[PDB]
Amino acid sequence: QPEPDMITIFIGTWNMGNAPPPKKITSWFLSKGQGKTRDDSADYIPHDIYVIGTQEDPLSEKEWLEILKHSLQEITSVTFKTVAIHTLWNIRIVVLAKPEHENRISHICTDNVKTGIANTLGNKGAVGVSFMFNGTSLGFVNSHLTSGSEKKLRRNQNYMNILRFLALGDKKLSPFNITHRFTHLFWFGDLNYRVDLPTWEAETIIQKIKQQQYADLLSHDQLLTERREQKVFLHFEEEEITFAPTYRFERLTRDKYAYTKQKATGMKYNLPSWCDRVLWKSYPLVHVVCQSYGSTSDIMTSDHSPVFATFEAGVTSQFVSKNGPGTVDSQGQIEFLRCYATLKTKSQTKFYLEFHSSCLESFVKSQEGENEEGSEGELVVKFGETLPKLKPIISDPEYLLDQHILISIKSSDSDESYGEGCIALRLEATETQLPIYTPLTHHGELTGHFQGEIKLQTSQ
Ligand SMILES: Cc1ncc(CNc2cncc(F)c2)s1
């Protein structure tokens, strides 16, 4: 039975509004309703992995798992295995996988982050799950960010706290946050970004939604505008939105948006908004294709509608050779030529690099680079031809061309990372000098760039 080179992944996010679900929720897992929906001809085909994020979830873990498993069994006639479940307050993540994957999944991690301080600590934050699927690392984040139209900056701060402090994936990747630890990272939830239009325009917005004319609303969506301005979710993707705003509905229908200020809302307006979102970030040149992104129309117990997204994702096999794992494969090497880091720092410490990759026995430290002053007042750190030659554990091009090198540039004075990025080994040529490039981030904000050339030698 061959190992897969692709899987499909279902991502669901639903703010349940503290109400139990209705008896039938299958439309969620079938990607049926509004937006980019799944073809009816696929309804019996199970996804490989289902990741369910809830917010304001009133159920016990046992109660929700029974509903989820019975839903999937009805759709697919498959009894899914529980990979992980983790709950912080009323924020929950469930991961389910086809039984045939049970011995493909390992290194399961869970964690949570509580956002805010004093007043604002006690219900917002994030839960996450990571694991290895054969040779591929997968991370999943469900976050419930700060509410309210005038708190976009708070949401952005919540985002940065979550990516800094959520401890998932390989703890040996010490310089790297969750935005660099996984082949594929999915981040979803009630992100709570709003359509920024004046309150007086509520009925006009409702009109536009009834006409299915979303363009003049999406152009004011705070998540799209903050992402365009590089304030949040730098280097993440989101599918185009083609479904109506998923908040705030009157319960038990979808005919009415409930936007007016009430004592129950803290006298705040809740103009119709795309609160409920799915974004992803995959390593460079890894296959990932969104095959659905939409909302259900028939699940009406909450003031939010459920959101679904599905993906094709590239995966690799747990490779063994005569040599690696447990030795190098002398026939393989990775060389870096003419490399330099450009950093936004004012600091004047010397810097060194760390190269991390599961194609190495352990990470590799470089010599210090040569600092030069750049023409527009930046720091340029030159490595020239001084970088260590990296010795992969396996030389087979079928393995090595699918790998990635994580790079951290660290201060010699403090050993703190000033920037992290990732280089794909999926090159146009071997034994050939080729340009490489990554942006560098720290705490998920842009701090610089790394560029140079690579020369990859495989056994072929
Ligand atoms: C990484 C990014 N590149 C462009 C972005 C903005 N995308 C957008 C879509 N629709 C309506 C808008 F106002 C903006 S985010």
UniProtKB/Swiss-Prot annotation:
GO terms for biological process: apoptotic process; determination of adult lifespan; immunoglobulin mediated immune response; intracellular signal transduction; negative regulation of B cell proliferation; negative regulation of bone resorption; negative regulation of interleukin-6 production; negative regulation of monocyte differentiation. One of its GO terms (cellular component) is cytoplasm. Changing residue 288 to E: In one patient with acute myeloid leukemya; somatic mutation. Specifically expressed in immune and hematopoietic cells. Expressed in bone marrow and blood cells. Levels vary considerably within this compartment. Present in at least 74% of immature CD34+ cells, whereas within the more mature population of CD33+ cells, it is present in only 10% of cells. Present in the majority of T-cells, while it is present in a minority of B-cells (at protein level). It is found in: Cytoplasm; Cell membrane; Membrane raft; Cytoplasm, Cytoskeleton. The keyword Protein transport does not apply. Keywords: Apoptosis, Cell membrane, Cytoplasm, Cytoskeleton, Hydrolase, Immunity, Lipid metabolism, Membrane, Phosphoprotein, Repeat, SH2 domain, SH3-binding. The keyword Lipid metabolism applies. Phosphatidylinositol (PtdIns) phosphatase that specifically hydrolyzes the 5-phosphate of phosphatidylinositol-3,4,5-trisphosphate (PtdIns(3,4,5)P3) to produce PtdIns(3,4)P2, thereby negatively regulating the PI3K (phosphoinositide 3-kinase) pathways. Able also to hydrolyzes the 5-phosphate of phosphatidylinositol-4,5-bisphosphate (PtdIns(4,5)P3) and inositol 1,3,4,5-tetrakisphosphate. Acts as a negative regulator of B-cell antigen receptor signaling. Interacts with tyrosine phosphorylated form of SHC1. Interacts with tyrosine phosphorylated form of DOK1. Interacts with tyrosine phosphorylated form of DOK3. Interacts with tyrosine phosphorylated form of SLAMF1/CD150. Interacts with PTPN11 in response to IL-3. Interacts with receptor EPOR. Interacts with receptors MS4A2/FCER1B and FCER1G. Interacts with receptors FCGR2B and FCGR3. Interacts with receptor FCGR2A, leading to regulate gene expression during the phagocytic process. Interacts with GRB2. Interacts with PLCG1. Interacts with tyrosine kinases SRC and TEC. Interacts with c-Met/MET. The SH2 domain interacts with tyrosine phosphorylated forms of proteins such as SHC1 or PTPN11/SHP-2. It competes with that of GRB2 for binding to phosphorylated SHC1 to inhibit the Ras pathway. It is also required for tyrosine phosphorylation. The NPXY sequence motif found in many tyrosine-phosphorylated proteins is required for the specific binding of the PID domain. Belongs to the inositol 1,4,5-trisphosphate 5-phosphatase family. This is Phosphatidylinositol 3,4,5-trisphosphate 5-phosphatase 1.
